[PDB]
């Protein structure tokens, strides 16, 4: 329902998916040769099947391939500061793969929007969707677009002719919440005849 979802969300408005009261098998996730790279930071990508969790927060957004490294702790950038942030103690995995076959148009796919101008970096797991005009000068423009006022939102052009280093990609990030409650998200335990 998440990776094969019908609709996608913008990076500046990254949707949050809540996972609870279900059994998830990650063998198909990391055993598939159709996923570009699944960046796993915090515990393990493989020997984690002996660890349970209460709730899992799932987020997904479309970014360019040049920004793959930006989705990580201790990173700075457009998305890494003004749109998303990961703490240095983050637990979870990040997955990205090619999206040219689904999110590219000859005339350019401009449906995806991202924040470009911001006064300060965001907190971890903090989503900013404000459309307030950014003032880059000392003299205020009284909320009027002009020399000292620029739109904080920006879009990227996706075309089939774009190179492998410039094709669009879809990035999915997963995080785990471990409160003082019994676990609700479990993995398939070993079964034998």
């Amino acid at each position, epitope marked *: 329902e998440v990776f094969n979802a019908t609709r996608f969300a913008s990076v500046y408005a990254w949707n949050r998916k809540r996972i609870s009261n279900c059994v998830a098998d990650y063998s198909v996730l990391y055993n598939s040769a159709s996923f570009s790279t699944f960046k796993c930071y915090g515990v393990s990508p493989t020997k984690l099947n002996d660890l349970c969790f209460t709730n899992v927060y799932a987020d997904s957004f479309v970014i360019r391939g040049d920004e793959v490294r930006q989705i990580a702790p201790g990173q700075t950038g457009k998305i890494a500061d003004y749109n998303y942030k990961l703490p*240095d103690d983050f637990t979870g995995c990040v997955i990205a793969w090619n999206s040219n076959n689904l999110d590219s148009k000859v005339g350019g796919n401009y449906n995806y929007l991202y924040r470009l101008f911001r006064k300060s970096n965001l907190k971890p797991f903090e989503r900013d969707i404000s459309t307030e005009i950014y003032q880059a000068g000392s003299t205020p423009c009284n909320g009027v677009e002009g020399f000292n006022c620029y739109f904080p939102l920006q879009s990227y052009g996706f075309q089939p002719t774009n190179g492998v280093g410039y094709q669009p990609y879809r990035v999915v990030v997963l995080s785990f919440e471990l409160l003082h409650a019994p676990a609700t998200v479990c993995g398939p335990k070993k079964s034998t005849n």
Partner: antibody
Amino acid sequence: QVQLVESGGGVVQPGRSLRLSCAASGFTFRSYGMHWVRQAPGKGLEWVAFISYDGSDKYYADSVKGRFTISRDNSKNTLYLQMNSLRAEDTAVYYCARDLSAGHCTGGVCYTAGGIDYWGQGTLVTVSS
Amino acid sequence: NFMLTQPHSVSESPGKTVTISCTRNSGSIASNYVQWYQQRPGSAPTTVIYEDNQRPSGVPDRFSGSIDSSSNSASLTISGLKTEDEADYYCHSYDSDNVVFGGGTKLTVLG
């Protein structure tokens, strides 16, 4: 900012035993897989070994297979390398490193790889006549 | 175990692009882990490219890696070099037993 500090190398007599360490600062050390790599003057990079984030999985080199010892301790936020049996070639600064990815995969092959973007200050072993 | 070969010295003016034949003569290096590091002499090496075409922070965008799928090799492309780029380039990776380093390079900027 995240940074690593290594110290302990210097004047050491051949054939003896020694202990080295990697100080860490900035990130959750226990959430990462540590490194051990040496760089000889007049030569290039000479990787030594690797270690899983929790110490269960360890990976080593063929040239000094069994000749050193590699270890880490989570609580003290430190990384260690109980190297032994120094020879002529091993004159090399030792660089402790952070992993760019923990255990990433192509899709079919899943191992704890090694990727370095942030390095340490450097400690150099001096074994000479 | 394995061995990569690098031209120990290549000369090229900064206006054009240089390439390196990261040739590991044994086995195969397809669908495995990829690394690349650059060293200013007398200092610690600096990473260039990891896993095909991924570049670190602060490095000029001019660098760009590549892999020859048919010939079982790799290559690095840097467009519009600079005299500041005079350094040592190394080819590291990991086959799933150990890590191998290449012969090294001495790139010369003919400016």
